[PDB]
């Protein structure tokens, strides 16, 4: 899951903001106009990983063709033998 960085936004009381992208993920670095009675707010709620992905994540693994082992137990005469053979 994302826990989007929901940062404290950038607000100019009389000035204007033109915020482009830093090297981050999905933003919506959007720069809304006349608000908080012009003033301007450039909110950029950019996604990242969650607070914990070492515990709950996923691995989209691709799979090619497979082998076969075995674990054969062979008894001949009075002797048994444990092995493993591809």
């Amino acid at each position: 899951k994302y826990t989007t960085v929901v940062p404290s936004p950038k607000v100019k009381c009389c000035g204007t903001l033109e915020c482009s992208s830093a090297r981050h993920a999905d933003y919506n670095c959007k720069v809304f106009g006349g608000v908080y009675p012009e003033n301007s707010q450039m909110s950029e709620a950019y996604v990242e990983f969650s607070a914990d992905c070492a515990a709950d994540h996923a691995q989209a693994v691709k799979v090619h063709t497979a082998a076969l082992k075995a674990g054969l137990r062979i008894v001949y005469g009075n002797t048994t033998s444990m092995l493993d053979v591809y």
Binding site: P7, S8, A51, D52, A55
Partner: protein, 195 residues
């Protein structure tokens, strides 16, 4: 561990039909365990009791007067709940760790605020339950561990003195960018539980 300063939050439905300038406002919440454990990103710092001294039994509320006056509340008085009452477990700075069983509302009272986030009911087995069973069998799960551990989440703090957090309530990110970063406690370590 209160190197930093508290803040005040803009809650919703505080002990009344009141969204207000709040105390201990939740401001973010993690709901990821397999018991009913909730992690809350509160408004006030919880260690630095007497304005410089990291303590336990008291805390660092940015009080309701608009003068940044921290007034030394007793930490045996922050009652939080979700839809019935909820016993808290740990606190460190901006953070609370509690285990709060129902959903649809996440309150932080005293009287004070809430958050109507769906705390969906979850279990871990194949046979569902509400309270833990009596005897059971202990299959594995995850837990928010409540002693010391950190998560490596890297949430940032900035300027208004001390550091000031990058909260969605807060404003103070105008010129003092390029700011440092702490990281979140309560690592959510694997463990085992009863089904």
């Amino acid at each position: 561990f209160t190197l930093t300063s508290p803040y005040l939050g803009t809650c919703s439905y505080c002990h009344h039909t009141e969204p207000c300038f709040s105390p201990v406002k939740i401001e973010q919440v993690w709901d990821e365990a397999d018991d009913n454990t909730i992690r809350i990103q509160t408004s006030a710092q919880f260690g630095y009791d007497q304005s410089g001294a990291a303590s336990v039994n008291k805390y660092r509320i940015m009080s309701l007067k608009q003068d940044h006056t921290i007034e030394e509340g007793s930490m045996d008085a922050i009652k939080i709940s979700t839809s019935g009452p909820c016993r808290r477990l740990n606190h460190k700075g901006y953070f609370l760790l509690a285990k709060c069983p129902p959903g649809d509302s996440v309150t932080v009272s005293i009287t004070s605020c809430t958050l109507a986030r769906k705390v969906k009911p979850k279990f871990v087995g194949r046979e569902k339950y509400d309270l833990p069973p009596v005897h059971g069998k202990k299959i594995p799960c995850y837990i928010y561990d409540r002693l010391k551990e950190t998560s490596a989440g890297y949430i940032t703090m900035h300027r208004p003195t001390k550091w000031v957090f990058n909260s969605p309530d807060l404003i103070r990110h105008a010129d003092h960018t390029a700011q440092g970063k702490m990281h979140l406690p309560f690592k959510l370590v694997p463990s085992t539980c009863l089904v």
